[PDB]
Amino acid sequence: PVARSWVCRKTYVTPRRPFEKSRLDQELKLIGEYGLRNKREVWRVKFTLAKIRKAARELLTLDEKDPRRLFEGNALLRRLVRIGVLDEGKMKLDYILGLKIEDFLERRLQTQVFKLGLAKSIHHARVLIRQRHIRVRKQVVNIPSFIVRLDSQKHIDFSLRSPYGGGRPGRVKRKNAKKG
Amino acid sequence: GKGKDITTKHDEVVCGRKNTARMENFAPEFQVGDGIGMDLKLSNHVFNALKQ
Amino acid sequence: ELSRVDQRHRASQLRKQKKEAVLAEKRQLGGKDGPPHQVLVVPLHSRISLPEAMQLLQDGTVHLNELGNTQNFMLLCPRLKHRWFFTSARPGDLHVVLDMAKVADTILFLLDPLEGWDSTGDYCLSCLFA
Amino acid sequence: ARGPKKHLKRVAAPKHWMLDKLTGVFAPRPSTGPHKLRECLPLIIFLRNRLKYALTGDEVKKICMQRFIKIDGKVRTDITYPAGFMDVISIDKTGENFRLIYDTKGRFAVHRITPEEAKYKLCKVRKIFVGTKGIPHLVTHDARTIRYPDPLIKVNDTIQIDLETGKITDFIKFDTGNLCMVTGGANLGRIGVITNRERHPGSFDVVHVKDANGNSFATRLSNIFVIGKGNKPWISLPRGKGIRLTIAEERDKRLAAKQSSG
């Protein structure tokens, strides 16, 4: 007997066909557009999307006036709206099925640094995210997979302790400035 | 490339064209034809069957 | 073989046989009828001084035999009912290590904490494996 | 097992204690007492989880053994004492009295009561025997054996009793049109008016009870505790009036609360 929990999940599913050209094609294209480390990130996002779609498939089969369908579906639509995938106009459980992987990959903090102009390349966005230069509200996030919410999308800043932010230039400026 | 016009290593158009161009260097008894004048995109399963 | 008792009793017989073999093996060393247990000590790395560990290990009733260069002794304990004969070797001197490591019953290697072992000790250990 | 078990594992602990999953292997085994190990609240769980007064088990030791806690007007020093339903807890130093009443969702609420209200409690009579030279006895749900009751008191009724004197004061009879509370099953904590009691000789008397909002439900007979004569309860009630809000309208209330204060 111990005071621990062993509950844990695998967040990806490997594809069944190992080397087919179109699958490797699509995954490499998404790696290029959204600047990712390996294929496990694409598999992770595809598995989360499969989770959401499987939930929607279990919810469509119920009757329209089912209380379970109503509550679970409205909560799921609220969740996908707050992430920044669906739209306030199309808040229906039918439209959840019409979702694509890049609609989730557009919400990563890497791409949100890239699009909003905080950086200039998506690999640049990743290298700024890892090195504690980008904050959200008041917390320095170091993870390039942070799914940024809609209310949280508005204010992403320079992380004032950073040299790009408030002050304190780093070790390289400090060393080169004391050369003479 | 970058952005959204990323033509990758495993592109079906480029790989098919390369498969036809690789088919052009077969043995002389093999009959190829004029698959370059028209655009061929010859897939790996088809080309692997032919190559075999 | 059937008859769960029969399979179990056959397994118990085989267990008895292999335990009798093991017990018959292990009394041949370090006991009242057995000869002494010879332990040869090699400090592999050059930083290690074998006298320090050699005096930590010497305490049991000791009998300090002596030679010209090497210093080996006899140990006897009725606490563990064990007779030991510790003999020390230097790496690099492949003569002594080779001709008395082929009769020693157990080799104890000493290793420095910071590095693995010396290159001379590496040569000695390669020869001893070989 | 060769004798009575003395430890309780945390995950085997009554779910309503809302114990954690990760603090330890064990849970407080409620001592033997006036209430079942499942239908009760050890004093330690009430003191260091519900009220946040103590932070460890050792601070509950330091509190209970100073003699501040009283259950039913008697000083109880046991840290795992089984405190249960309709139960009055008095702390004189803070000068505050709570009642343990079941919550809407089936848990124990902390229901702060007036010190005027702390003088009495309600006991559901469980059996009535006549022993030793024609002397009648009640056994209530707190195992309070009471001699010489009112002869009108029958089984499954309620008696309001005084804590200091230990004697009964007045009884509510089990009759249709009496406000009852459920003490078990899925309907636990829901409070409504009794409409029908149906008989099954041999098995358990199922009872149909109409809630305040018109949502009728049913229980077994043993899970019923009568409080109100008519519609007016004999005690004070939690922040919810005992009506079970369904999930969607609870979310409606939650969203309205977020809209109210921002």
Place this chain on the structure above:
Amino acid sequence: KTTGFGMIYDSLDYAKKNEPKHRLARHGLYEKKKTSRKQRKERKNRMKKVRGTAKANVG
């Protein structure tokens, strides 16, 4: 941010009475015994093996 828990006692004697002793030994108000468990247990079983006032002699 840094989040901690802090408690404020009324007088010092109440703090001596109610605090865990490891939080008193951080302020020097309390001194822990300096024997190891394994030593205190070997000693306990040793004096278990003896009966009478000779239980006090063993150490």
Place this chain on the structure above:
Amino acid sequence: GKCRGLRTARKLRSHRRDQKWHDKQYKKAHLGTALKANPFGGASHAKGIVLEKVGVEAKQPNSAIRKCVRVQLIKNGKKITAFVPNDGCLNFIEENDEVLVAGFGRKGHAVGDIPGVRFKVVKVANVSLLALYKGKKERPR
């Protein structure tokens, strides 16, 4: 055809188990003689001592000599032919040594060129043959 009534369950279930005993893979799992004649005794790996070296002749269209070894398992004492995997590795195996032997990969069926030899040596003297063939570690004795 099939018995297809509504009270026909025990006939269907008896039929299932009776006919399922004609399944080769199921019978091989559950007759229990395929786990009592199995030399490894349902083990992924066994450990043995080399009795002799053997050259097994190749099968008809393939012309070679495959370098095998007759080893004897420790745990029951059976005699097993094992195939030394890579080129020039039989010299690492010396007479009477501890060998860690695996299956060859077809689950009891003889694999490839070597006839009736269905095991391969993985380790010698508790050093892997892959390290010795790649010249990474040294074999003691």
Place this chain on the structure above:
RNA sequence: CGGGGAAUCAGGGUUCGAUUCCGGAGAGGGAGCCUGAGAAACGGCUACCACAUCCAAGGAAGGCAGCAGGCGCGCAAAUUACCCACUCCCGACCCGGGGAGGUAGUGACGAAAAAUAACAAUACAGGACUCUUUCGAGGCCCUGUAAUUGGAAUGAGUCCACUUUAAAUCCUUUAACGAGGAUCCAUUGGAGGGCAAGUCUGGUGCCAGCAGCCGCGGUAAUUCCAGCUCCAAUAGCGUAUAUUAAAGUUGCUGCAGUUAAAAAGCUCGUAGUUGGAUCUCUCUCGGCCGAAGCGUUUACUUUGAAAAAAUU
């Protein structure tokens, strides 16, 4: 050992569950007891069996399927650590005890996140666009490659201080030093088809060997062995075994039986399985209702209350 349950899975199902929660059983094998509320108890006793320890040879003492550790068995599994501070339990008990439990150590069982480089200018190489018959020339065009140049930003590390804690360690927070790729250098499998990526170069020459299967090697070896280049996954990746989906190759959903594996030689016959059509609520006791019988009995369906937590 059973269950809660685990893996897989469209639907149906298949397989597993020694294993932290519940219930059971046993402390080497059997047996019999003492005391006590509770034991046929073994960190209690008495015997026999099998092992086995100290002898002064008269005797005495056992029981790690508790925690650490050893032997042995093996393909297969960690420290003779620290503490009752947390969780709870025991006692005469705001105090004592706790290898229950917590905490560190070993730990690539498995799981989550996530570095091994980013930008700019040049220097080439291509691709389009424009001007040029072409060759060629330009762009505030694109795309690559550069032990090319420039700066900035960082963490792995070494180290202080704080925090953490029972005392520590770790994570988190600060000063200090700390990065030009010719290293602070990423591996493991593969390049004949299945199956992604070479008819590239050298060696061996149906030898050695490779290869799950089909097959290759007998001299231009597309398969061996190296180099170079390249592919796959990526701090992971090979192999072996068991089991699952693929397998509608176990078929209830949903297989087959002329010729491919298969219908009994033929008929009777019991259990089994299956079986044509047919039929549209009240009398007494109590306050329009409550009690009492219902109606031949079931299958079926629907509702209700009971159904452990963890897992889902």
